[PDB]
Write a protein that binds this ligand. Structure first.
Ligand SMILES: Nc1ncnc2c1ncn2[C@@H]1O[C@H](COP(=O)(O)OP(=O)(O)OP(=O)(O)O)[C@@H](O)[C@H]1O
Ligand SMILES: Nc1ncnc2c1ncn2[C@@H]1O[C@H](COP(=O)(O)OP(=O)(O)OP(=O)(O)O)[C@@H](O)[C@H]1O
Ligand SMILES: N[C@H](CCCCNC(=O)OC1CCCC1)C(=O)O
Ligand SMILES: N[C@H](CCCCNC(=O)OC1CCCC1)C(=O)O
Ligand SMILES: [Mg+2]
Ligand SMILES: [Mg+2]
Ligand SMILES: [Mg+2]
Ligand SMILES: [Mg+2]
Lengths: 250, 250
């Protein structure tokens, strides 16, 4: 009569946040619901949450005067050392000289330096894309995730302006937050949505940067987790197991 | 007086397709032009070609009834073997059990199988994203590229329908092509834009697929190369060296 832990685990896979003994009937009910959810997505919008969020965020920053960057995901291992990373044990190495980027900063540093030769002050850029870190199991971490990093360099690089961009950005997405403060974290309850920095910092010199700057990095899967009230960030990930938070194991 | 080969190489970095002794003046002219090009992008649209193309392609397929997939880039090595790949020497391995995906097929096979339990016939899906292959130097190949793979499974999986989708798709993008024919290549002159397949094929059984299907895979950087008349596909890649085909080394 009482559901086993394994049965409960199975039902929880099929349970969605907005949902409101014997196991087989409960399972059948949830299977029907989830099939109908996929059918509705297929019939109507057909957009993947992670893709759609990237597009929405892209529009926000492009509209605010930030240049869209698409830089390599596979980066030189040298960039890790040059980032002052002696995270060191979290790097996915590829061949002898490369790794999967654990963050967007090194390529954006290079872009800021290069673009400063061409673009008027201030320089405003952003990137959204895959980042990789070896992580311990956890409901808030993925080994394959998607970062947004925006930054501004030159005039107007104040904490006030950084907080303003963050605030406008999250109010646009409709995500509740608190900024907890040079360095700031953007929190949703106890979940970190972003780390933000008001530069300059001593690392800049290694990258040929000698101007003020502000920037922040956000995990898109974390944003989705909060927005859609997913219990586990796995529902928001690139996945074969979940589609828009709906189990594909039906 | 005569430009050296190295000087010509430098000028060719700065030359754009639409452009129409002494070296320093030629260099200065091209530098000014390319800075102005970046300034215009920054002032006006601010979109990255590779990002924008992905968005345009996404809209095309979503509008045509195809479900947008975002699946893992880091995939089990087992998937390679299960794809009948004994390309074998082109795989970027990561740790003991994983690799960077060289193609979108294995994850899409899994999606087709899973979605067949939920969605009405025919099942139409697509993915756009990073793929990785170790390649010899060449003007048409990147080690890090972006694939579009669409497919349909069930009813209507005919060569005629596959050719129709391809034709509508490339006429939409404004890319000239010829389809050269079960299996088809979509050519732009001697450059392969896509390989396409009319299933079923014997590989399907390994992935739990036993329905007719059609599908095709396109390289986005190749599409950009053709569309923008880039001499080298490096101008279309995720890069720190080129932005929308414009040298960042100014
Ligand atoms: N493994 C991960 N999975 C999902 N999102 C991540 C992961 N690592 C970082 N992020 C996201 O990227 C943002 C910026 O990266 P940062 O390096 O500041 O993370 P972090 O300080 O290591 O986070 P945490 O303390 O939660 O590990 C984080 O605020 C988070 O939103
Ligand atoms: N290394 C690469 N760089 C850029 N695009 C690629 C690369 N490999 C494949 N593609 C693109 O992906 C498409 C489908 O992949 P497929 O495995 O059929 O390529 P392929 O037959 O190996 O191509 P090629 O003969 O040019 O190496 C190709 O038609 C091409 O547009
Ligand atoms: N790099 C991640 C995310 C931090 C985002 C804030 N930093 C930031 O925007 O750096 C700018 C990007 C290129 C150099 C300046 C971290 O280590 O927390
Ligand atoms: N996989 C690449 C691209 C081929 C694209 C055509 N194949 C295709 O769409 O396969 C479908 C995708 C999942 C299984 C059926 C190749 O090896 O050529
Ligand atoms: Mg961390
Ligand atoms: Mg942090
Ligand atoms: Mg090849
Ligand atoms: Mg081919």
């Amino acid at each position: 009569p009482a559901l086993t832990k394994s049965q409960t685990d199975r039902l929880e896979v099929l349970l969605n946040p907005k949902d409101e003994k014997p196991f087989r009937e409960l399972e059948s009910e949830l299977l029907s619901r989830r099939k109908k959810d996929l059918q509705q997505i297929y019939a109507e919008e057909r957009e993947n949450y992670l893709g759609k969020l990237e597009r929405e965020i892209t529009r926000f920053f492009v509209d605010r005067g930030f240049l869209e960057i698409k830089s390599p995901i596979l980066i030189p291992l040298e960039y890790i050392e040059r980032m002052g990373i002696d995270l060191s044990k979290q790097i996915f190495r590829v061949d002898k000289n490369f790794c999967l980027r654990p963050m967007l900063a090194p390529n954006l540093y290079n872009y800021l330096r290069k673009l400063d030769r061409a673009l008027p002050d201030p320089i405003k850029i952003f990137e959204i894309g895959p980042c990789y870190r070896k992580e311990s199991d956890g409901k808030e971490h993925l080994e394959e995730f998607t970062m947004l990093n925006f930054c501004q360099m030159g005039s107007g690089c104040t904490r006030e302006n950084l907080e303003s961009i963050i605030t406008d950005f999250l109010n646009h997405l409709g995500i509740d937050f608190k900024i907890v403060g040079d360095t700031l974290d953007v929190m949703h309850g106890d979940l970190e949505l972003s780390s933000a920095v008001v530069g300059p910092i001593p690392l800049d010199r290694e990258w040929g940067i000698d101007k003020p700057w502000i920037g922040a990095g956000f995990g898109l899967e974390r944003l989705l987790k909060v927005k859609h009230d997913f219990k586990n960030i796995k529902r928001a990930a690139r996945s074969e197991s979940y589609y828009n938070g709906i189990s594909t194991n039906l």
